[PDB]
């Protein structure tokens, strides 16, 4: 009401980024978001990046430890040691995902004015439930995986009607929705199906591309391409 | 005495490294050092690697924020935000160096038999006091600097009486020692002379490089020349 300076938070969030201190950066944007004000494209970018870094570092640590755990199964204490370290990391992963999901469902998504940013948050929602999914105990895994799917799906509809096939975010949605299908629902089928499509529909309008993102669209289109054959191969 | 196994901590430390969680890694190696045993060659590497990464990130952020704390000034408001963020980072930085300095002065240096490690720890000592010197205030800055120089100085002796001009640790000692004179005591004079002399003495016996550390010896020499080069203008 007078206790928060939403503008200084953004500067500080921007300062934490330069300093490569993303936990701090994420802490500032979470706080900017809770002020209830619909985010500007720069702020949305600052939020996405911060949390991308914060959650991403853990997802990468998890994988490394998730491996060492297996490839060191023979022994007990050792493997057993790696298992606890992994659980320590999953607790961190969850706290991060519950927070982004909470901001996403209570502040961002409901106040998305434009369709472009609505799809973007819906996509984030899909990504973060997916992160919870990758580390959920079989019992809760079903419900979670479903949260992800329906979030991506809802973003996929909105995009398939308000956004051009070449728009970076729509393409980005297809990129991760397709990954969700290959890595989560372990369905190389539905996967490839979506990644190839979204790619053609982009090509069909390669001229609809703009210098405003011709470098971004194709960039993601290369990732869609790379993954695509990476699976067929 | 039965509450913590040194070997399991080391494995904990290596696991953390693989997952690139250096703070966890440093905490493990700190525990290993406190176990009271002179460190092995592997354990020493794990310690310096971990702390180099932990303090490195802070020094790095300290600079990014300090430099931005300047490009401001005119904005007393933003300047305060920057300044406080700098102090926060300083407190972290200062805590890390304090711990390392404590480990070195209490457990490591005192129980360093082989003249190699002793020089390595004595050097680490000069380095960490140097890090403190960079963020110290005029008041106590002198004494701190006085601590950096003394630690390097004695390390410089033992080396130039036990290590060849080509041994990596001796070369490294000369590099940071020369970086201290230039960056800290502000005098490229004694800085270049020390760097250039550590280099000339290297090549003099150039064909003394062992396949085991020629690349290592080489990397230190390039830096010595590059730094020296930059000090030549
Ligand atoms: N989702 C997404 N959107 C945009 C605009 C991109 O350029 C890219 C890739 O560069 C992606 C895929 O993003 P990640 O969530 O995997 O970082
Ligand atoms: N001091 C030092 N020693 C050794 C054995 C090295 O290989 C290197 C460089 O890789 C150095 C310089 O180390 P920093 O204190 O700048 O990380
Ligand atoms: Ni207020
Ligand atoms: Ni014990």
From Swiss-Prot, chains A, B:
It is found in: Cytoplasm; Melanosome. The delta, brain-specific form differs from the zeta form in being phosphorylated. Phosphorylation on Ser-187 by MAPK8; promotes dissociation of BAX and translocation of BAX to mitochondria. Phosphorylated on Ser-61 by PKA and protein kinase C delta type catalytic subunit in a sphingosine-dependent fashion. Phosphorylation on Ser-61 by PKA; disrupts homodimerization and heterodimerization with YHAE and TP53. Changing residue 61 to E: Loss of homodimerization. Reduced dimerization with YWHAE. Significantly reduced interaction with P53. No enhancement of P53 transcriptional activity. The modification Phosphoserine is found at residues 61, 187, 210, 213. Changing residue 56 to R: Found in a patient with a neurodevelopmental disorder; uncertain significance. InterPro entries: 14-3-3, 14-3-3_CS, 14-3-3_dom_sf, 14-3-3_domain. The record marks 59, 130 as: Interaction with phosphoserine on interacting protein. The modification N6-acetyllysine is found at residues 6, 71. GO terms for cellular component: blood microparticle; cytoplasm; cytosol; extracellular exosome; extracellular space; focal adhesion; glutamatergic synapse; hippocampal mossy fiber to CA3 synapse. One of its GO terms (biological process) is establishment of Golgi localization. Pfam families: 14-3-3. The modification N-acetylmethionine is found at residue 4. Its main location: cytoplasm. GO terms for molecular function: cadherin binding; DNA-binding transcription factor binding; identical protein binding; phosphoserine residue binding; protein domain specific binding; protein kinase binding; protein phosphatase binding; protein sequestering activity. Interacts with CDK16 and BSPRY. Interacts with WEE1 (C-terminal). Interacts with SAMSN1. Interacts with MLF1 (phosphorylated form); the interaction retains it in the cytoplasm. Interacts with Thr-phosphorylated ITGB2. Interacts with BCL2L11. Homodimer. Heterodimerizes with YWHAE. Homo- and heterodimerization is inhibited by phosphorylation on Ser-61. Interacts with FOXO4, NOXA1, SSH1 and ARHGEF2. Interacts with Pseudomonas aeruginosa exoS (unphosphorylated form). Interacts with BAX; the interaction occurs in the cytoplasm. (Microbial infection) Interacts with Epstein-Barr virus protein BPLF1 and TRIM25; leading to inhibition of the type-I IFN response. PANTHER family: 14-3-3 PROTEIN (PTHR18860). Adapter protein implicated in the regulation of a large spectrum of both general and specialized signaling pathways. Binds to a large number of partners, usually by recognition of a phosphoserine or phosphothreonine motif. Binding generally results in the modulation of the activity of the binding partner. Promotes cytosolic retention and inactivation of TFEB transcription factor by binding to phosphorylated TFEB. Induces ARHGEF7 activity on RAC1 as well as lamellipodia and membrane ruffle formation. In neurons, regulates spine maturation through the modulation of ARHGEF7 activity. Belongs to the 14-3-3 family. This is 14-3-3 protein zeta/delta. It comes from Homo sapiens. The lineage of its organism: Eukaryota, Metazoa, Chordata, Craniata, Vertebrata.
């Amino acid at each position: 009401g007078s206790h928060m300076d939403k503008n200084e938070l953004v500067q500080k969030a921007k300062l934490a980024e330069q300093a490569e201190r993303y936990d701090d950066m994420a802490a500032c944007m979470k706080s900017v978001t809770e002020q209830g004000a619909e985010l500007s494209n720069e702020e949305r970018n600052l939020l996405s990046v911060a949390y991308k870094n914060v959650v991403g570092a853990r997802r990468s640590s998890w994988r490394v430890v998730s491996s060492i755990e297996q490839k060191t199964e023979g022994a007990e204490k050792k493997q057993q040691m790696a298992r606890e370290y992994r659980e320590k990391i999953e607790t961190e992963l969850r706290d991060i995902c519950n927070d982004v999901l909470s901001l996403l469902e209570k502040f961002l998504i409901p106040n998305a004015s434009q369709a472009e940013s609505k799809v973007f948050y819906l996509k984030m929602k899909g990504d973060y439930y997916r992160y919870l999914a990758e580390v959920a105990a079989g019992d809760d895994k079903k419900g979670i995986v479903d949260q992800s799917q329906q979030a991506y799906q809802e973003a996929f509809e909105i995009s398939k009607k308000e956004m051009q096939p070449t728009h970076p975010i729509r393409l980005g949605l297809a990129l991760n929705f397709s990954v969700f299908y290959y890595e989560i629902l372990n369905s190389p089928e539905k996967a490839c199906s979506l990644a190839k499509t979204a790619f053609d529909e982009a090509i069909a309008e390669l001229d609809t591309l703009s210098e405003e993102s011709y470098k971004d669209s194709t960039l993601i289109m290369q990732l869609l391409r790379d993954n695509l054959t990476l699976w067929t191969s």
